[PDB]
Ligand binder design. Structure first.
Ligand SMILES: [K+]
Ligand SMILES: [K+]
Ligand SMILES: [K+]
Ligand SMILES: [K+]
Ligand SMILES: [K+]
Ligand SMILES: [K+]
Ligand SMILES: [K+]
Ligand SMILES: [K+]
Ligand SMILES: [K+]
Ligand SMILES: [K+]
Ligand SMILES: [K+]
Ligand SMILES: [K+]
Ligand SMILES: [K+]
Ligand SMILES: [K+]
Ligand SMILES: [K+]
Ligand SMILES: [K+]
Ligand SMILES: [K+]
Ligand SMILES: [Mg+2]
Ligand SMILES: [Mg+2]
Ligand SMILES: [Mg+2]
Ligand SMILES: [Mg+2]
Ligand SMILES: [Mg+2]
Ligand SMILES: [Mg+2]
Ligand SMILES: [Mg+2]
Ligand SMILES: [Mg+2]
Ligand SMILES: [Mg+2]
Ligand SMILES: [Mg+2]
Ligand SMILES: [Mg+2]
Ligand SMILES: [Mg+2]
Ligand SMILES: [Mg+2]
Ligand SMILES: [Mg+2]
Ligand SMILES: [Mg+2]
Ligand SMILES: [Mg+2]
Ligand SMILES: [Mg+2]
Ligand SMILES: [Mg+2]
Ligand SMILES: [Mg+2]
Ligand SMILES: [Zn+2]
Lengths: 83, 129, 141, 217, 98, 149
RNA sequence: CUGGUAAUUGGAAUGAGUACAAUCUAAAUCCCUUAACGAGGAUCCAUUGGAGGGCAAGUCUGGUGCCAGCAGCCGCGGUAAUUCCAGCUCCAAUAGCGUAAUUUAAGUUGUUGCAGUUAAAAAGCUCGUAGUUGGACUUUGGGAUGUCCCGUUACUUUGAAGAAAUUAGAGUGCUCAAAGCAAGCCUACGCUCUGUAUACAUUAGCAUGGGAUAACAUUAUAGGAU
RNA sequence: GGGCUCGAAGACGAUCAGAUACCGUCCUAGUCUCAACCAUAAACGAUGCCGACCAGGGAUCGGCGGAUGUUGCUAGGACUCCGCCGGCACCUUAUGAGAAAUCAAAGUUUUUGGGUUCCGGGGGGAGUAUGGUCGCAAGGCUGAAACUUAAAGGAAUUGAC
RNA sequence: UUUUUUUUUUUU
């Protein structure tokens, strides 16, 4: 949200679920954030480089977090040349 | 029996979006349904949808962005003049900054903002946001 | 569920009209029974004192509530009227002329007094409040 | 003085975390009220809303305890609610103040129409429900004021909302449920996905990951 | 308040079930509701088995068995202790006792 | 669901997406019409004709080869019955039920079923009167229903 | 220096009243104006309801003792009464305030917008005429540039017309205000053509553009179109 | 017409302070059937019907498709496995609802609108009075008011019993 | 499975 002038007005921008697109609220203590490390040509972890995924409590309580994260990681690894 | 195919389509999309599904199925298809979906897609509330031919009313598969809070039908289709749009939006939409009411006017099926722009009235079909 | 047909306005209107009678307030003001009641739809009524009566207070209280039996002049109906304030029954006599008002709950008993819906406002053209405060004096005749 | 027992408390005491928005972003639980006192303590105000006695029947009579309802807020988008039951009124009030501090949440404020100046009302239509009590907030134009009962009005004032329309259904004379429904309605402000939030989220390191080395000792 | 999902009986997709007579008091009770027990015991009690066997008039003989189906009303079943009052969670268990 | 019961069965035919005749079929449209007319002359209803064609002559759908429905072909040749086949069968069922009830006064189930069947007959007859498949004077009467068939 | 209190002191101010006079007025009266009078306990003396909670205000003092009484409701009173009868003090409004059909609150009549398992509630079951409701399908696109190419109704847009008064609303110092439709410059033997706008108005009727969504009627024994 | 059994009413025997009862004994009407009435039940899932969507799982009834190996049997039937449709239900779960108890429909409801019927509006008076209508009768259906009253009532918690 | 009836009004 912005003013007519163009100033940012919101207190903060909440994160969104990587799978459901839902807004992750401040009291959502079932939500998690995961970093998947990247590997070089020799299968060694490159420090500081990873793909970040966030899951809201709703999807994790449903048990669908595993498959959603698997699909998201597969797509992101295909895009990022991590194989 | 089936009375409003548009209601069934919108309710299926709403339930699927709440469940988090990436795709939903609409059966039977209709040109009113297609126009509603095109209005929704114009504003980024849905992805690509595909019509399936079966030598019958048809079928539609809709991609869901995850941006749809709620889409609904209004029944019966009340008469809405150009001056009643403000009241209808106040009744139905969460805010004046976003959200759309779909009307069927003699100029075609369109959202309420376009109806205000063209100064055309008609009948209310539904809403989405 | 409700009827929603665009051509079903008549049914909705008729259903509301029929269901309004289940409302007690609506039925009271639309049955035309207020004219058969002692006041006949008036805020006040004059009457003649027939007899002083003591009414026992309801549980858990214990008292003798002083009331008067009054016959309304305009229709001859007999009612019980409470006489408020300490010792104000001494200002009432048989065959006296009294102005009667409602007890404040629109035809229902108030407090621990059973079956009394009226109170005395004036006696012999002088308000009971003035008599209680000695502002005025009850006419001798 | 204060000896933090949590990673968040250690970071807040070490000045690594300086704004409540940093904690709100990652949805981290807050289990020490000293965190809130350090972050937004100076601007916070408290108010006891109700002292409610409750009784438990026992073999030798009724054991009475008192329920304290406390509301805290900075009047600038932060508000918290606290409920505590104790034998003594003072102990209950202290516990309620602590709990209200621990439960402070961010409140999103938007514009009714034209977006000039600071936000003045709720961004959208929101509804809260506790027990049978349902509280609905509707955006209102500038100058409309807070159209609400005294309990919701106080809760909204502590949240910094300038004008809003409200409606309530159910047993609003149940003060606890009324205030809890108002609080739930206010919390739901930041959960509604609007078109202005359609932008892709760009994640940032969590405080436990950003300051992992410091917390490693 | 409703305390049993089945309403204390075993009727589903059915209008009426004919009743039985309680084997103890003779009270009428729907068959699907009556507490039914099947008792299979030796005619000769274990105490008298040896004495009866010693007096057998044949080289070999297997003692018969007594078969009885008992159908109780709820009151008699509780009073006779065929069934007992259980806790709210324990009365949802349907398996027979081990 | 069912009109006069609580059944919710969904068993039905599944017409293929292909509307053209199969390649192996070689019969011609006029030939198919000739066989249909012959069967109708022999006293077969359109449903029976279609069943026979499908089961014996390899004609899955008459419309695929002829381009028109069986009843349309029969009408074009002046062979359609005076009353439609489904209404005829409903009336036949009603007549049978009434004949059975004549000797069974205690059979209240048969009375219930007769009420249902006659309601169906009347609704169908009203529809056929609306579409001018029956004369406006047509009326179903239980007393002389047996004459109609 | 800054504030609050005092039937302590001190002089100032003034209208309620009174009254020449003028003014007002058809004639009177009132108002406005104004000679002479008119305030210290400024006796030129403010009342109506309350003080447990809802709901602002006393665990003060005396009397009564489930009596008398209060109390819209919950409750007070049985010998230590914040609740009655009184004194003092305090609170609310204030030249006003108390008491005895109708609106809101009432989403407790629910079209927007209520309920029907156990709170009040779905007919024992099915059929069924009025009523209400009723699946899909018939011309889309580009090129260009509002324009060119390939039966009856509902509904909506626009226009006319649709008494004033009342409502909303523009202007205007009746000393202000409720009002009213006045009025303003300058003292010119006058002027501002002074102003006395504008909006709103269910349904139904009249005229007009649109042809999405709907309703009724029609279709093939060709007796069809040309 | 039947009338075995049981058994309103009734009669006795007990128990009891009494016992017009509970317990025992004998029994009329009834209980059964036919013809004609009656139309009410906690007639209950205390939960209208049609249609759409909506989690998982194992059982089971009917039909059907496929696979496979046996049968003291006559391609079939019985059994085994995998599926589809329809049905009576059950178990787990909340991302749902609810005042909760609970409910996979009592969900998709202040983010309120698929179609349609019935029906409630604090507690009593009262399912009463009156009128009408049906019934041989018993009674059924339709169905008020005067007046009275601050609670009655639902779910759940602790204690006491 | 013999028999077991009753506890003035208000208030704590
Ligand atoms: K008493
Ligand atoms: K008392
Ligand atoms: K039950
Ligand atoms: K049982
Ligand atoms: K049916
Ligand atoms: K079938
Ligand atoms: K008060
Ligand atoms: K004394
Ligand atoms: K005293
Ligand atoms: K008081
Ligand atoms: K007999
Ligand atoms: K007997
Ligand atoms: K006894
Ligand atoms: K009967
Ligand atoms: K039941
Ligand atoms: K099954
Ligand atoms: K008392
Ligand atoms: Mg119980
Ligand atoms: Mg039954
Ligand atoms: Mg039907
Ligand atoms: Mg079906
Ligand atoms: Mg107070
Ligand atoms: Mg005293
Ligand atoms: Mg006093
Ligand atoms: Mg209600
Ligand atoms: Mg009950
Ligand atoms: Mg009930
Ligand atoms: Mg019922
Ligand atoms: Mg009927
Ligand atoms: Mg349609
Ligand atoms: Mg006998
Ligand atoms: Mg009989
Ligand atoms: Mg009944
Ligand atoms: Mg099977
Ligand atoms: Mg009532
Ligand atoms: Mg006794
Ligand atoms: Zn028994």
């Amino acid at each position: 949200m912005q003013n007519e002038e163009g100033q940012n007005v919101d207190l903060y921008i909440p994160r969104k679920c990587s799978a459901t697109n839902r807004v992750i609220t401040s009291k959502d203590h079932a939500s998690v954030q995961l970093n998947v490390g990247h590997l070089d040509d020799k299968g060694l972890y490159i420090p500081g480089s990873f793909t970040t995924f966030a899951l809201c409590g709703f999807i994790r309580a449903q048990g669908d977090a595993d498959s959603a994260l698997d699909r998201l990681w597969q797509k992101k690894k295909v895009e990022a040349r991590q194989q | 029996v089936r009375v409003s195919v548009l209601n069934d389509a919108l309710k299926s999309m709403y339930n699927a979006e709440k469940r988090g599904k990436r795709q939903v199925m609409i059966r039977p298809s209709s040109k009113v349904i297609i126009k509603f979906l095109i209005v929704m897609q114009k504003h980024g509330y849905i992805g690509e949808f595909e019509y399936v031919d079966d030598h019958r009313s048809g079928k539609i598969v809709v991609e869901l962005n995850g941006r749809l809070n709620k889409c609904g039908v209004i029944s019966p289709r009340f008469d809405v003049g150009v001056k009643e749009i403000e009241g209808w939006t106040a009744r139905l939409l969460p805010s004046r900054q976003f959200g759309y009411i779909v009307l069927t006017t003699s100029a075609g099926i369109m959202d309420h903002e376009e109806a205000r722009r063209k100064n055309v009235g008609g009948k209310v079909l539904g809403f989405f946001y | 569920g409700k009827t929603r047909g665009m051509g079903a306005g008549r049914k909705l209107k008729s259903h509301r009209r029929r269901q309004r009678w289940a409302d007690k307030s609506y039925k009271k003001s639309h049955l035309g029974n207020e004219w058969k009641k002692p006041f006949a739809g008036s805020s006040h009524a004059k009457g003649i004192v027939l007899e002083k009566i003591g009414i026992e207070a309801k549980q858990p209280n214990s008292a003798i509530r002083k009331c008067a039996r009054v016959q309304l002049i305009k229709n001859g109906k007999k009612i019980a009227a409470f006489v408020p304030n300490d010792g104000c029954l001494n200002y009432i006599e048989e065959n006296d002329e009294v102005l009667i008002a409602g007890f404040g709950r629109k035809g229902h008993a108030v407090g621990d007094i059973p079956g009394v819906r009226f109170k005395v406002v004036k006696v012999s053209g002088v308000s009971l409040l003035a008599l209680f405060k000695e502002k005025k004096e009850k006419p001798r005749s | 003085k204060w000896v933090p027992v949590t990673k968040l408390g250690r970071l807040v005491k070490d000045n690594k975390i300086r704004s409540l928005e940093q904690i709100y972003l990652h949805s981290l639980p807050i289990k020490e009220f000293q965190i809130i006192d350090t972050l937004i303590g100076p601007s916070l105000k408290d108010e006891v809303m109700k002292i409610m006695p409750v009784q438990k029947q026992t073999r030798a009579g009724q054991r009475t305890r008192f329920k304290a309802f406390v509301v805290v807020g900075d009047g600038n988008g932060h508000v918290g609610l606290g409920v505590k039951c104790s034998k003594e009124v003072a102990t209950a009030i202290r516990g309620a103040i602590i709990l209200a501090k621990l439960s402070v949440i961010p409140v999103r404020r938007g514009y009714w129409g034209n977006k000039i100046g600071k936000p003045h009302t709720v961004p959208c239509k929101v509804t809260g429900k506790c027990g049978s009590v349902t509280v609905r907030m509707v955006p209102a134009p500038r100058g409309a004021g807070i159209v609400a009962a005294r309990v919701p009005k106080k809760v909204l004032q502590f949240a910094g909302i300038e004008d809003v329309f409200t409606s309530s259904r159910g047993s609003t004379k149940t003060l606890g449920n009324f205030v809890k429904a108002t609080f739930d309605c206010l919390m739901k402000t930041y959960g509604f996905l609007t078109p202005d939030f359609w932008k892709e989220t760009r994640f940032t390191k969590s405080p436990f990951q950003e300051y992992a080395d410091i917390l490693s000792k | 308040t409703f305390k049993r999902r089945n309403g204390g009986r075993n009727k589903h997709g059915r209008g009426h079930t004919k009743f039985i007579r309680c084997s103890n008091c003779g009270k009428c009770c729907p068959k699907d509701k009556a507490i039914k027990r099947f008792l299979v015991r030796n005619i000769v009690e274990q105490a008298a088995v040896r004495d009866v066997q010693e007096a057998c008039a044949f080289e070999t003989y297997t003692l018969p068995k007594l078969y009885l189906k008992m159908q109780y009303c709820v009151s008699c079943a509780i009073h006779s202790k065929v069934v007992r009052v259980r806790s709210v969670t324990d009365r949802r268990v349907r398996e027979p006792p081990q | 669901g069912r009109m006069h019961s609580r059944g919710k069965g969904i068993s039905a035919s599944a017409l293929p997406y292909k509307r053209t005749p199969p390649s192996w079929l070689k019969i011609s449209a006029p030939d198919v019409e000739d066989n249909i007319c012959k069967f109708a002359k022999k006293g077969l209803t359109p449903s029976q004709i279609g069943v026979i064609l499908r089961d014996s002559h390899g004609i899955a759908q008459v419309k695929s080869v002829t381009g028109s429905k069986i009843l349309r072909i029969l009408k074009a040749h002046g062979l359609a019955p005076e009353i439609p086949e489904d209404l005829y069968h409903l009336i036949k069922k009603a007549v049978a039920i009434r004949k059975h009830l004549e000797r069974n006064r205690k059979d209240k189930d048969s009375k219930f079923r007769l009420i249902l069947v006659e309601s169906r007959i009347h609704r169908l007859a009203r529809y056929y009167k609306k579409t001018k498949k029956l004369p406006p004077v047509w009326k179903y009467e239980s007393t002389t229903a047996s004459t109609l068939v």
